[PDB]
Curated annotation (Swiss-Prot), chains A, C, D, E:
Transmembrane segments: none
Family from the record: Belongs to the rotavirus VP6 family.
Lineage per the UniProt record: Viruses, Riboviria, Orthornavirae, Duplornaviricota, Resentoviricetes
SUPFAM superfamilies: A virus capsid protein alpha-helical domain, Viral protein domain
Protein task: Intermediate capsid protein that self assembles to form an icosahedral capsid with a T=13 symmetry, which consists of 230 trimers of VP6, with channels at each of its five-fold vertices. This capsid constitutes the middle concentric layer of the viral mature particle. The innermost VP2 capsid and the intermediate VP6 capsid remain intact following cell entry to protect the dsRNA from degradation and to prevent unfavorable antiviral responses in the host cell during all the replication cycle of the virus.
Keyword ATP-binding part of the UniProt annotation: no
Region ranges (Interaction with the inner capsid protein VP2): 62-73
Pfam family, one: Rota_Capsid_VP6
GO molecular function: host cell surface receptor binding; metal ion binding; structural molecule activity
GO CC terms in record: viral envelope; viral intermediate capsid
Major location (coarse): virion
Organism: Rotavirus A (strain RVA/Cow/United States/NCDV-Lincoln/1969/G6P6[1]) (RV-A)
PTM characteristics: The N-terminus is blocked. Sumoylated with SUMO1 and SUMO2. Sumoylation of viral proteins seems to have a positive role on viral replication.
Name this polypeptide is given: Intermediate capsid protein VP6
Length: 397, 49, 397, 397, 397
C-alpha cells in the first residue's frame, strides 16, 4: 500500500517541478528517486479491471531513464518525459479504481486486487517517500497503533433522522406534548411543544430533553448553539404515529428556559453549558444531551393571554427549541464532511462503472445507512477506499 | 549503445540483465560466425554479455 | 505567466526557509535557483500601472548574489537578504495588480500589461520551479489541453433568483397553485403550494416540479437534501406577477410526497434519488430536477379537517417543499465558492484602485451577472485573473 | 519560539520521509538538519508542568546519531530511529501544553514557561528550518513589525447578541414598531416590524436600520445577502424590555424596500450595495450598516387588505428583514472560524488539565466574552496560544 | 492528427507537381519530404473498418524510394510513382472514413480508431508540414489555445423554426394581434399583425418585437436588412395554437414604423440600427433583437379607409415586417454554411456506409437538431470530423 502513495507524490512533485526552465540541481534529489522506480518496474506485467463495466486493460513496461543536460532543462527534455508520465497517469487511475471497489468481510482492511496484492510484494518497497499527505500520514501511524486523527468542516456524524415523540396525546390530537427533531450531518434541531402551555404542569413548566448518540467520538469540536428551532416554528399537518390520520401543529415560540447542553463520553459529562448560546467547545464526546423547558409566562399582555386559555380548545401551541451545529471537529475514524470529496469520489467511481453491490457497503454507498451501522469492517474498508481516493486526487480530479 | 558509452552506464542494463530480463541493443557492432553444432548446445551466445 | 508563478514560491519557500540558524545544505538546492533569477533580471527595465487611480512605478535591477560559502546562517546574513527581498515583494504586488485589471475580448486568455507581455519573453523562461500550487497545477494542464479540476466548499453555481410561478390564479388571488423558490450560491429551496389542498385534483394529488440549469457541469458533488422549504413556510404578502397588486400566502406545511431528484447531464439522468433525504452524491450533472407532490391527507383529525374545507374561502394554504445544498463539488471551470478569496481579491483590487468598467466583466465583478452569462471570454479572463490572485496570496494577504 | 516550530516540521517531514525502503539521497539534506539538533540538545535538562492537574514529567538528553551509508533504507534503520523520535513526540506535547496555559497581563505576547524561556536562548537558535506552515509564516512577519494576514471560511467576528429595540410601544404591546436581531459568528439576521403597517407613516413607509460594529477589520470578505429574516418570521411570545410581562409577535412578511448595505471603515463608506441580493464583496470594513424599509402595499387584494385595517386591533404584524453571511474573509488578527481547530485545541487542553482561570482570558476561553472585549493583551496571548496549537497539530491531532 | 494532414498536402502538392517534363529543382525540396515518409512507414501493418457496411481492408508497406538523380523527369518516372501513390490514396480514404464515424462523450475531441490512435504515436510525427489549409491552420491554434476563426457565406446559425405567437386572440380568431416568423439558416423573416389596425391602441401604434438567440457568437457579420416579410404577406389558413381549429390570415402590408435592430452580446448592445435598410455590419453578437411597429395611417384615401373600419368584422389584416440575412460572418466554432461541403461530406460518408446512430450526433447528422443542442461534445466531434472531411477533399472529391 504505502507503495501506491509514492507512485503519486512522485508524479505530482514531478509533473510540477519539471518545467521548461528550472535548473537541474533543483531536482537532483528528485530525478534520482524517479529513475529508481522505472528500474524496479520494467518487466513485471499487470492486470486491471474484470468487474462490472470496468475495462480490463493490460499494462506492460519498457522505458529508458532520464538524461540530465545541465543548466536548466530544454523543452525537448520535457516532452520526451511527459510522454512517459502520461502512461503512469492513465495507469494509476486504472489501478486506484480497481482496488476502490473490491470489499471483504473477514480481512477487508488489506489489499484485494491482483494489481495491488502484487504491490505489497517486497521487491517494490524500495520506493516510499515524502509522506506529508495528511491521509498517508495517518495510514502509517495506524499500522503501528497510536493517536491518529483527521480534520473536518461541518462533519457528517448524524444519520438522517426526522421524527417526533408524543409524550401526551389523544385520538383528536388537540392537546399534545412532546418533541420533534431533525438530526442530519453536523446539525441537530429539536423542538419541545405543549399545547396546554403548561397550564396544569408543576411550576407551570414542562421539561424536554433530546439525546443524540454519535456512532464515533468527536474531539476538539467547535459548536454553534442557538435558541429556537426554525424548522419547527411553522404550521404543519403531520402523520400520526400509527399512520392512520394527521394532526395539526400550530406553533407559537417562547424562549427555551433552563437550557443545558451536556457532551458526554461513556456516560460521563465532559462538557456542560447552561444557557450559553453562540460558540462553545466540546472537547471529547460520544453523546449530546439537550435539556430545555417551556415555562408558562407568569405575566401576559392581553394579546398573549388570549393565546393560552384555561380550557381547550388549545389553538396556539407553545413551542421552545434549540439548534446545534458542529462546525468542525476531529475524529479518529474517517467520516464524510462538507469539504472533502472522498465519499463522493468513491461513490462516483462505483456508479460510473456500474459496480455491483458488494458484501460490505450499503447500496449506493448510502451515507445514512453507512453511519447508522458503522461496523469495524465498513470503517476499515472505508478508510482504505478513502485513502486511495485521496491518492488519486493528487493527480486526477 | 552509442547513447550509453558516450554517457557511462547507470546499470539500468545491469539490473535488467541480472534479473535476467528480455532486452535489446541498437547500432553497429563486431559479429562472430561459428559452425560448432555443439556450441549452440553450450548456449555460448548467452555468455559474452 | 508560468514565469510569474515561480517568482513567488521562490520568495515564500524563501522568506520561510531562511532564518538565523539552519544549515546551508537544507537550502543548497534553493539558494542556487534563487541567484539564477537575479542574473536574468539585472539590467532589464520595468513599468507598471497607468490606469485609473493606479500609481505608475518604474523599477531597475542591480543586486549582489549570495554567500554560497558559510556552513551555518548568521543573523547578519538574513538582514542583508530580507532587504533585497522586500523590493521583490513590493514589486510583485505592483505587478499582479497591474495585470489583474486589464480585460480583452479577442484573446482574453493571454497576458495584457506592458509588465507581463515582457515576462512571457523567452530570455526569462530560465526560472520556473515547484508548481504544487493547486492553481498553477491546473493552469498548465489547460494549455496542454487535458482534464483539469478544482476543489470547492459551498460553491457558487446558482445566480441569485428568487421568484414564483402561478399555475392557477385569478384576480383575487384567493385560490392559487404554483411554486416559489430561491436559487442562490450552492443552495436551492423550492415550495409548491395549492390553496385548494388538491380538493378537485386527480387522486387528490397536485404535482410540482422545479428545474435548475447549471451554467457549468459539476462533478463529484456531495449534496444535502432535506424535506421542507423553511424560507417559504411563513405568511407573506407578495407582489402579483404584473406588479399591479399584492396577494396573501398563508402556508401550512405537509410532507412532500413522491420526492424525486434527478441530476441530469445533457438530458440524460445520471443520478436519481427517490425520497432520499440526508447526504446524496451527484457525480456529473449540468441540471437538477426536483419533482414532488402535495397529496391531500386521506384521513384528518378535526383540527386538520378544519383547515381544508370543500369550498372557498381557502384560508390555510397547503405547501410542500424541498431544500438542496451542494456542500462540495469539482468544476472544470473556475467559480466563486464559500472558502476561496479569489473573487474577493480581484474585486477588491479593482475597487480600491477605481478601475473603470471594462469590456469583459460586469460592473463590480457582480457574481450573479457573471455566472448568468458565463461566456468563454469571461471564463478565460476569470481564470487568468483568479490564477494571478492566487499567486499574489502566496506573499500578500 | 521560532525554535519550537522547527522541532516539529523536523519530526513530521521526518516521521513521514523515513520508511522501510526509500533511497537515501531524498533525505540527505534532511538527515543532516536532524542530527544538528540532537547535538545542541544533549547536555540539557528540562521541566514541564506544575499547575492544576498537569503532570510534571522531567527530561534528560544523551543520544546517538545516524549512518550516512546505505543506498536504500533497511527496516532495522527505521525502528532504531522511531524509538528516538517517540521521546521527542511525547516531549513536545508536554512542552506545548505547558506554555499553552500561562497568561501574563504584561508581556503576554512573549514566552512564559521555564521550558520555553530557555528555548529562546541563543545557543539553540542553530536549529530553525522550513517555515511554510501558514501560522509561523505569519508569526515572523509580525515580530518584524509588518503587515500580517489569515484565511477563514465562516469567521467568528460577531459576539452572540440576540435582542430587540421597540421604537414605538405601549403597555399592552398591541401596536409596536422596532427591530429584532441575531448577530452570531459570521451571520446577521435582522427584522423590522410595524404593527400598524405604516398606516399613519409619511409616504406609508417605515424606515429601519441595523448597525453592527466589528471588533476587528475584515478585508476581502465574500458575503451572501438575502432578503427576509427567517428567524423572525414566525409567531413569538417575547419578554418585555423591563422583564415585567410578555408581548405577542405575529409576523406577516413583505419584501424589504430600498435595501442599502454599507460596509464602512472608520465612518467612511468603502462599499455600498442597493438592493443587491446574492454574493457581494466587502473589501475592507469595521462596520456594517443595513438600512431597509417597510412600505405599506399601495394595492391590496381582499385577503391582503383584511390583514391591515385602518384601526386597531392590529393582528397581523408587517415585517421586513435581511440576512447577511460572511462566507470568507481575511483578518489581520487571529479569530475563531468554522474550519480551524485552534480555539478548540487551546480550550480543550485547558479543560482536560483543569487549568485555573487566569488574568487574561475569560472563563472557559468563552468566545463571545473574548471577542466582545478583544483587548491587545487578549489578542497577543491568543495569537501566541493559537500559533502553538498549530505547531502541535502538525504532529498530534 | 496533424500527422494525417501532411499525408495529404503531401500527395496533392505531389500528384500535382509531378508531370512528364518539369525540371527537377521545382521539387527537390519536395521529393525529400516525400521519401522521409515512406521510411517511417514500411514495416508497420494497419487495420481499418469494422462497423455497419464498412469493409475491413488490411494494409502493408514495403516501397522503393524515388531516384532523386535525373534533371528532367521522363514519363517512365511518373508511372512508377503514380502506381505507388494510388495505394496511399485508396488508403487514406479508408482511413478518414474510419475515424469519421466513431464518437466519444468524454474525450470526443481526441482520436478514436485503431488506425489513428497509432498515428498520434511519436515515431510518426517525423512528418508534419505546410499547414496552410484554412482548417488545419485553425486546428492547431485551438490545440495551442488562441482566437481561432473561420470564414463563411450565408452561414447556418438558425435552427429551423417557423411559428407564431398570438398576443391577442379569441375563439373565432377574427381579431388577432401577434407575430409569425421563419428563422432558418442565415435568414430571419418576421411579421407583426394587428387585425384591428391599432384602432384602440395608444397613439394608434402597436409595438412588435422578435428576439433570436444564436447558439454561437458571430463576429464580423455583413448583413442585409430589408423592410417587409414577403413570406407572411399572403393569405393563409393556419392551425390554431392548440391544434383544435384553423384561422384565416388576410394581410395588407404597411411600412414597418420605428424599426430598431439590436445585435447584443451577453445582454449588451454592441450594434444598433434605427430604420436602416440595406447593408449593415454587426461586429460581435450572440443575439439579434428586431423591434418594429404598426402605426395606423393618420390619413387615408377612401380605398384605404375602407379596409380599416371602426368596428369588426376586420377583413383586411394590417401587417408590418422585416427580413434579415447574414451574408457572411466569422465564427469561432465550426458551422455549416452555403458554400462548404464539410457537413455534406460527413453526412454522406455515414449514409453511404450505413453507419449506426452513435451517442453524440443526432440521427442523420440533422443540422437543426445539432445546432439546437450544440453541446461542447458535439462541437469537438464536429470539428474533428469537419477537419478530416477537409483533409479528404484535398484528394478525393
Ligand atoms: Zn460551511
Ligand atoms: Zn449566395
Amino acid at each position: 500500500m504505502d507503495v501506491l502513495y509514492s507512485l503519486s507524490k512522485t508524479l505530482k512533485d514531478a509533473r510540477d517541478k519539471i518545467v521548461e526552465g528550472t535548473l537541474y540541481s533543483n531536482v537532483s534529489d528528485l530525478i534520482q528517486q524517479f529513475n529508481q522506480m522505472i528500474i524496479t518496474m520494467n518487466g513485471n506485467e499487470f492486470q486491471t479491471g474484470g468487474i462490472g463495466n470496468l475495462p480490463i486493460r493490460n499494462w506492460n513496461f519498457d522505458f529508458g531513464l532520464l538524461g540530465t543536460t545541465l543548466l536548466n532543462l530544454d523543452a525537448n527534455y520535457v516532452e520526451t518525459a511527459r510522454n512517459t508520465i502520461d502512461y503512469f497517469v492513465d495507469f494509476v487511475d486504472n489501478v486506484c479504481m480497481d482496488e476502490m471497489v473490491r470489499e471483504s468481510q473477514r480481512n477487508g482492511i488489506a489489499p484485494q486486487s491482483d494489481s495491488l496484492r502484487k504491490l505489497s510484494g517486497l521487491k517494490f518497497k524500495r520506493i516510499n517517500f515524502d509522506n506529508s499527505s495528511e491521509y498517508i500520514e495517518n495510514w502509517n501511524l495506524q499500522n503501528r497503533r497510536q493517536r491518529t486523527g483527521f480534520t473536518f468542516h461541518k462533519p457528517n456524524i448524524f444519520p438522517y433522522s426526522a421524527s417526533f415523540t408524543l409524550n401526551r396525546s389523544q385520538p383528536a390530537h388537540d392537546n399534545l406534548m412532546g418533541t420533534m427533531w431533525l438530526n442530519a450531518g453536523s446539525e441537530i434541531q429539536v423542538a419541545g411543544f405543549d399545547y396546554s402551555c403548561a397550564i396544569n404542569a408543576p411550576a407551570n413548566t414542562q421539561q424536554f430533553e433530546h439525546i443524540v448518540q454519535l456512532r464515533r467520538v468527536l474531539t476538539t469540536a467547535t459548536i454553534t448553539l442557538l435558541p429556537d428551532a426554525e424548522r419547527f416554528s411553522f404550521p404543519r399537518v403531520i402523520n400520526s404515529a400509527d399512520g392512520a390520520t394527521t394532526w395539526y401543529f400550530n406553533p407559537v415560540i417562547l424562549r427555551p428556559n433552563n437550557v443545558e447542553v451536556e457532551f458526554l463520553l461513556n456516560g460521563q459529562i465532559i462538557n456542560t453549558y447552561q444557557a450559553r448560546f453562540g460558540t462553545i467547545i466540546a472537547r471529547n464526546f460520544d453523546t449530546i444531551r439537550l435539556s430545555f423547558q417551556l415555562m408558562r409566562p407568569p405575566n401576559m399582555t392581553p394579546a398573549v393571554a388570549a393565546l393560552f386559555p384555561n380550557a381547550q380548545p388549545f389553538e396556539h401551541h407553545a413551542t421552545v427549541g434549540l439548534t446545534l451545529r458542529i462546525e468542525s471537529a476531529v475524529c479518529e475514524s474517517v467520516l464524510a464532511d462538507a469539504s472533502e470529496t472522498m465519499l463522493a469520489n468513491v461513490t462516483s467511481v462505483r456508479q460510473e462503472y456500474a459496480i455491483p453491490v458488494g458484501p460490505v457497503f450499503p447500496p449506493g454507498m448510502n451515507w445514512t445507512d453507512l453511519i447508522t451501522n458503522y461496523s469495524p469492517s465498513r470503517e476499515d474498508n472505508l478508510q482504505r477506499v478513502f485513502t486511495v481516493a485521496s491518492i488519486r486526487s493528487m493527480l486526477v480530479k | 549503445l552509442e547513447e550509453l558509452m558516450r554517457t557511462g552506464d547507470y546499470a539500468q542494463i545491469t539490473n535488467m540483465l541480472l534479473n535476467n530480463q528480455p532486452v535489446a541493443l541498437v547500432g553497429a557492432l563486431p559479429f562472430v560466425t561459428d559452425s560448432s553444432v555443439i556450441s549452440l548446445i553450450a548456449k555460448l551466445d548467452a555468455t559474452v554479455f
